[PDB]
Amino acid sequence: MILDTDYITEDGKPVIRIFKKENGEFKIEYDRTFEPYLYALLKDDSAIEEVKKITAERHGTVVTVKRVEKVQKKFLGRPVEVWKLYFTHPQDVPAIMDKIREHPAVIDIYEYDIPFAIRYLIDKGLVPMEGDEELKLLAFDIETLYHEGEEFAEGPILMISYADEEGARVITWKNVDLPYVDVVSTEREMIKRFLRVVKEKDPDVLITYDGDNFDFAYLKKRCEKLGINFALGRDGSEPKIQRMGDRFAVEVKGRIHFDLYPVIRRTINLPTYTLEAVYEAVFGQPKEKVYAEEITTAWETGENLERVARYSMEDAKVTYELGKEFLPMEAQLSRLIGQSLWDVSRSSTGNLVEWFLLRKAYERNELAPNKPDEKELARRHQSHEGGYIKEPERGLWENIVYLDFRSLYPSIIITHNVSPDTLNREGCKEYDVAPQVGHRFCKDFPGFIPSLLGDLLEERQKIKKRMKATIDPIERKLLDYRQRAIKILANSLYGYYGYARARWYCKECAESVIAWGREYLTMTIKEIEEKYGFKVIYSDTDGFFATIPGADAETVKKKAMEFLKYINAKLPGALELEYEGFYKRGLFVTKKKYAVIDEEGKITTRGLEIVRRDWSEIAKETQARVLEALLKDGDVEKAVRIVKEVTEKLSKYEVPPEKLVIHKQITRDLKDYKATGPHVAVAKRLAARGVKIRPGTVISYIVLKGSGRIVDRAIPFDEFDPTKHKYDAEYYIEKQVLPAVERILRAFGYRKEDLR
DNA sequence: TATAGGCATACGACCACAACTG
DNA sequence: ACAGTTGTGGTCGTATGCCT
Ligand SMILES: Nc1ncnc2c1ncn2[C@H]1C[C@H](O)[C@@H](COP(=O)(O)NP(=O)(O)OP(=O)(O)O)O1
Ligand SMILES: [Mg+2]
Ligand SMILES: [Mg+2]
Ligand SMILES: [Mg+2]
Ligand SMILES: [Mg+2]
Numbered sequence: 001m002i003l004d005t006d007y008i009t010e011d012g013k014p015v016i017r018i019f020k021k022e023n024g025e026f027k028i029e030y031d032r033t034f035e036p037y038l039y040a041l042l043k044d045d046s047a048i049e050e051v052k053k054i055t056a057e058r059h060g061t062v063v064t065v066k067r068v069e070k071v072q073k074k075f076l077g078r079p080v081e082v083w084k085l086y087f088t089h090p091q092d093v094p095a096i097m098d099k100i101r102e103h104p105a106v107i108d109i110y111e112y113d114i115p116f117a118i119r120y121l122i123d124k125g126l127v128p129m130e131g132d133e134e135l136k137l138l139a140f141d142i143e144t145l146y147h148e149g150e151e152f153a154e155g156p157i158l159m160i161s162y163a164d165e166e167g168a169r170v171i172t173w174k175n176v177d178l179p180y181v182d183v184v185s186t187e188r189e190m191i192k193r194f195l196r197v198v199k200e201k202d203p204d205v206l207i208t209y210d211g212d213n214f215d216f217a218y219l220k221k222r223c224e225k226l227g228i229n230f231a232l233g234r235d236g237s238e239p240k241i242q243r244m245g246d247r248f249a250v251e252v253k254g255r256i257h258f259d260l261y262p263v264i265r266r267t268i269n270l271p272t273y274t275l276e277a278v279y280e281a282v283f284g285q286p287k288e289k290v291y292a293e294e295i296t297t298a299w300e301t302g303e304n305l306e307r308v309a310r311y312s313m314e315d316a317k318v319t320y321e322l323g324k325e326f327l328p329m330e331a332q333l334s335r336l337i338g339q340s341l342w343d344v345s346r347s348s349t350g351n352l353v354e355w356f357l358l359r360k361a362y363e364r365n366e367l368a369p370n371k372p373d374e375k376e377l378a379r380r381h382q383s384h385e386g387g388y389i390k391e392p393e394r395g396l397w398e399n400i401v402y403l404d405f406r407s408l409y410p411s412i413i414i415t416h417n418v419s420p421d422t423l424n425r426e427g428c429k430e431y432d433v434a435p436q437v438g439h440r441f442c443k444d445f446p447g448f449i450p451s452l453l454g455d456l457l458e459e460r461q462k463i464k465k466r467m468k469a470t471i472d473p474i475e476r477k478l479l480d481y482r483q484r485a486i487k488i489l490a491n492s493l494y495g496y497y498g499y500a501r502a503r504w505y506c507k508e509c510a511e512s513v514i515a516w517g518r519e520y521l522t523m524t525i526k527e528i529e530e531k532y533g534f535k536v537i538y539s540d541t542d543g544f545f546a547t548i549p550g551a552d553a554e555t556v557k558k559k560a561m562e563f564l565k566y567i568n569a570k571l572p573g574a575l576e577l578e579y580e581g582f583y584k585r586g587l588f589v590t591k592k593k594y595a596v597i598d599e600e601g602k603i604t605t606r607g608l609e610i611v612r613r614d615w616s617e618i619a620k621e622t623q624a625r626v627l628e629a630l631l632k633d634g635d636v637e638k639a640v641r642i643v644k645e646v647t648e649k650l651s652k653y654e655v656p657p658e659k660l661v662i663h664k665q666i667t668r669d670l671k672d673y674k675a676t677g678p679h680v681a682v683a684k685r686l687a688a689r690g691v692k693i694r695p696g697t698v699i700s701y702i703v704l705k706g707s708g709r710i711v712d713r714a715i716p717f718d719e720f721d722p723t724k725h726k727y728d729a730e731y732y733i734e735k736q737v738l739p740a741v742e743r744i745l746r747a748f749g750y751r752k753e754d755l756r
Numbered sequence: 757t758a759t760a761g762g763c764a765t766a767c768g769a770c771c772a773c774a775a776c777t778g
Numbered sequence: 779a780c781a782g783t784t785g786t787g788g789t790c791g792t793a794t795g796c797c798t
């Protein structure tokens with residue numbers, strides 16, 4: 001099993017290291033023969049003689065073109081002759097590529113910015129995380145001494161907890177009488193002991209929770225002051241901290257630093273991403289938080305360290321169990337993308353697609369297009385028309401079927417061969433022409449991206465079959481992971497076509513996919529209304545809700561099935577319409593906001609404040625209770641009674657503050673806010689003290705009683721003291737609960753109620 | 757240091773104008 | 779028979795998180 005690749009330099013030459021785990025033992029394979037390269041397209045073949053003369057300087061060492069080779073490749077489905085220029089060292093390329101491209105004989109260069117180890121995996125056809133080797137996992141966390149004015153890692157590390165299959169322990173240097181706590185003399189001895197623990201256990205995966213941005217940097221500052229060689233890597237190296245955009249990321253050579261925080265942020269949608277909230281969302285058990293001020297007051301008085309030791313231990317144990325439940329999915333994703341788990345777990349959608357496409361391109365000898373320069377990037381920032389949304393027939397409908405397409409945009413791409421290399425290609429027998437926009441796509445040869453998508457969808461349907469076939473939960477979970485990986489990749493390709501930073505960008509493919517989707521959806525709607533007597537209540541991008549207005553459930557169902565058999569005979573290629581489900585009642589409030597209930601009583605809710613993080617739980621829960629009373633029981637008096645009880649408990653200050661927290665994400669540097677709202681005000685105040693606010697931080701605040709601007713009365717929920725502070729009852733009544741419930745009531749048809 | 761676009765929703769920022777102040 | 783602050787109704791663009 002390949003765990004990772006990197007490279008070192010020996011006497012000026014790059015040496016690839018492949019970190020593998022085979023039949024239970026760790027191994028390092030060295031490759032000294034791999035050369036970096038780029039491609040150049042030239043106007044005159046005779047001009048190469050004076051492109052071998054191009055030289056640069058790295059920082060005092062002179063950089064030359066090691067050798068050249070004339071090659072034939074496909075670019076956008078057409079044959080091209082280019083020159084492959086090799087260099088001695090991958091750092092040569094950034095220094096000389098600019099003088100090459102800006103040569104008069106050079107039209108353009110290609111593939112000059114794929115990082116060396118990624119390039120190695122691609123060109124050798126190696127794929128990490130393959131095979132059936134079992135990796136050893138170990139989670140760890142640290143607890144530090146925090147004060148507000150202090151510089152980073154000013155204070156010592158208090159405890160280091162770690163957890164694995166054997167159990168969870170805490171190393172610390174004040175005495176604590178619990179069976180799982182190991183006391184040592186000093187902070188220095190605690191760090192040395194922890195390092196000994198990792199070296200003894202020798203895990204393949206080190207799991208943290210935001211270790212990328214706190215734990216490893218804290219450990220590094222402390223080891224620099226204490227004089228520790230923090231030799232965590234299997235080759236004896238220290239963790240390697242590097243800048244990734246606006247944040248940092250940490251490698252531990254020979255192991256995999258699995259930082260759960262990015263993984264979970266992009267895998268599940270939660271109102272807040274504290275470790276406590278994540279753990280209770282994933283496993284349903286609560287976990288108590290101890291705040292830094294508490295930990296410090298405790299440490300300085302020696303008072304209640306048993307409580308803080310338990311907090312530290314629990315941090316480690318839940319980090320271990322979360323890692324153990326999220327790792328397999330991320331390993332399947334990494335096996336599909338074809339890159340190391342460290343890379344895939346930290347990467348955005350665009351780069352995952354890019355890495356997959358570069359590998360497939362390499363297999364097919366297709367030259368990769370370049371990332372846009374600044375001018376082209378600015379040019380691609382015009383938007384295009386999106387999917388079709390019918391304005392709903394608002395209100396309460398009975399006996400509803402939902403019909404939708406199976407993978408609409410990928411099906412369109414596959415059926416109509418929508419690709420930059422088939423767009424307006426000349427000289428073909430057969431074309432498909434997108435509606436309303438007129439883009440023509442050759443049908444005589446499969447395009448690059450359509451063929452890849454074909455393979456992906458075929459194998460996802462094979463998997464969905466043999467998933468429920470197997471009796472084995474072993475293989476059922478492995479197949480579910482593989483199938484969900486395929487889905488994420490496949491449904492990112494429509495978006496990638498329109499991603500301004502994409503290599504295989506094509507605005508006309510994005511526009512054509514939209515046009516064909518709008519056509520298929522609206523034409524199917526017309527067919528069910530004209531030929532089958534259905535009324536279409538609501539429609540969004542790829543499906544629609546419909547009923548036969550006077551008909552009972554069984555005739556609605558059977559007519560829908562007849563329509564499905566009729567429409568699918570007519571749909572071309574991979575296009576197919578499916579029966580998603582039947583709903584006894586549905587409440588369509590507005591575009592993107594509605595709720596339906598099935599015959600068994602289960603309510604599903606889309607778009608309503610019920611699902612959003614930036615609405616307080618008192619409002620979300622009252623809206624759900626009003627929704628259940630109206631859509632499940634049809635009891636308006638019960639709903640009015642519910643609202644009256646909640647507004648009364650609010651105005652008597654009886655509702656616990658945790659049900660009043662509002663969560664909103666900071667989406668940018670605080671400097672770049674032109675309108676400063678409550679969560680921005682809170683975050684700016686926090687930044688003016690110690691707290692570092694980066695994009696994606698979730699601010700959780702509560703609105704205090706008082707007059708004047710709400711931005712000045714909102715405090716972080718962490719600082720709320722039910723003795724000191726009183727919350728703003730009237731804000732939570734008038735601006736949170738009543739709007740959310742009155743929108744439901746008005747959608748049912750009950751406009752005026754006392755609600756007081 | 758965004759895979760896409762479409763939507764509902766609330767509010768801050770700005771503004772013009774009136775009333776009121778040393 | 780005054781500049782400067784304050785209050786008072788408006789737009790209108792900013793911001794977020796959802797949906798497919
Ligand atoms: N995150 C996203 N980005 C871009 N387009 C998206 C999207 N989500 C949906 N669409 C657009 C593009 C899609 O073509 C369409 C529906 O995609 P699904 O709702 O994921 N349902 P499907 O049938 O594909 O998977 P399953 O087998 O689970 O039902 O909406
Ligand atoms: Mg921690
Ligand atoms: Mg902690
Ligand atoms: Mg579906
Ligand atoms: Mg988006």
Ligand SMILES: [Mg+2]
Pocket residue numbers: 404542543
């Ligand atoms: Mg769908």
